Amino acid sequence: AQNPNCNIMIFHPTKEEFNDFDKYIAYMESQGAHRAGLAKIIPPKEWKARETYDNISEILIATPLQQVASGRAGVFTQYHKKKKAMTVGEYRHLANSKKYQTPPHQNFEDLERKYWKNRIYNSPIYGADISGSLFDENTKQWNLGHLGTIQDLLEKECGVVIEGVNTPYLYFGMWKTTFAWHTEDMDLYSINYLHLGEPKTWYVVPPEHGQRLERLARELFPGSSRGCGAFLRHKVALISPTVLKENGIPFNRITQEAGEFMVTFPYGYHAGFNHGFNCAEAINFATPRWIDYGKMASQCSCGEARVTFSMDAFVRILQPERYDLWKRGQD
Ligand SMILES: O=C(O)CNC(=O)C(=O)O
Ligand SMILES: [Mg+2]
Ligand code: NI
Ligand SMILES: [Zn+2]
Incomplete structure (x- = not known):
């Protein structure tokens, strides 16, 4: 059995290996990557998602979510309070404000300590679940807006044609914004x-x-x-x-x-x-x-x-x- 300790694996595909998404997922699984639940893929050095990010500030976050915590530092729930719409440029300024910015820290481990110690005492604002894509249409490899759809996979495997669509979502985050424990839908x-x-x-x-x-x-x-x-x-x-x-x-x-x-x-x-x-x-x-x-x-x-x-x-x-x-x- 490959990866029996269920360690997170990190992959470095070549540009040649980056052409066929399904094949590469199956390769990672052949090496036991799924046993961890999570894998990292570092794209080939030649690849880019798009040319620049210089023109994204006018994207709208229609319903920013303030993540309010209840409980104790290590065991808490969060609820999402809806806030007024703001652009990505407005949100970035907010994230960089003294109230919301990342604190001084030594390294990722120090930051992780500060997160667990202090998260509950703050309510960061998350621009989550925004339908859309930042991949350039000309990016042919690992373009999350051009993947085979789950409906088509179910049809290929099981023979049944079903309604529904499958599109990506954008997430704009700041210090302390949090994703709770979950598995994916279905x-x-x-x-x-x-x-x-x-x-x-x-x-x-x-x-x-x-x-x-x-x-x-x-x-x-x-x-x-x-x-x-x-x-x-x-x-x-x-x-x-x-x-x-x-x-x-x-x-x-x-x-x-x-x-x-x-x-x-x-x-x-x-x-x-x-x-x-x-x-x-x-x-x-x-x-x-x-x-x-x-x-x-x-x-x-x-x-x-x-x-x-x-x-x-x-x-x-x-x-x-x-x-x-x-x-x-x-x-
Ligand atoms: O990035 C986030 O806030 C949450 N993302 C996920 O849970 C995911 O990609 O499965
Ligand atoms: Mg824009
Ligand atoms: Ni998830
Ligand atoms: Zn329920």
Whole structure:
């Protein structure tokens, strides 16, 4: 078995190897990358996502989200308070303000310490989940707006044609902006490219150990657990590395820098935070190996998780028994 300790692997494809996306994902899996739940891909030196980022300030963040925490430093939830629209140029100025900027620090580890110590005492503002792409249309390799669609993968694998579309999302972050512990919708893969700015630190649980994280989460968030049998689908709970270590939960961590891709694998729980002003782009995707994870994915039916139009068909075809109850939660 390749990568039996489930370490995060880092890949350096050549420009030749960067041509065929599906093939390279299958290669990474042949080396055991999926066992970690997360892999880093450093693009060939010849590759670029676009020529410059000089003209992005007029992108609109229609609903910036203020991430307000409740709990204790290592075990907290966050809720998202909607704020007034602002441009990316306005948001970048805000991120660089004295109130919101990254503090002085020695290195990523020092910054990570300061994050866990201090996050809950602040409410950073996240420009998340903005439909769109920063890849130049002429970028042919690993262009997240030109991937094969999950609907087409389900059709190729299973023969059933379904409605729905699959497009990327932009994320504009600042210091302390936070992504809560989650897997993807329908336990899909994700791919995330850090276009610009300051780093993003990731934490990940190997897929084979995801249920250990779920059991800890039920213990640590007991009211939430009673409310919903899949409450991590709400994407609100945070648990620190120290707490995970105290409770024996297997995990790994890595920092992504600008110019790097990360891939999350089916049922790889992940969480993290941004170091300062940045912009990332991410999208879900599928491979043949995903289908069995899709069929087994938990679902929130309490009404909180509320997701895209396109998840309907995935539930309806892969999980017909659950369909009725899950759709009640959607309506
Ligand atoms: O970058 C973020 O805030 C969150 N991204 C992801 O969870 C992802 O790419 O799967
Ligand atoms: Mg612009
Ligand atoms: Ni994710
Ligand atoms: Zn729920």
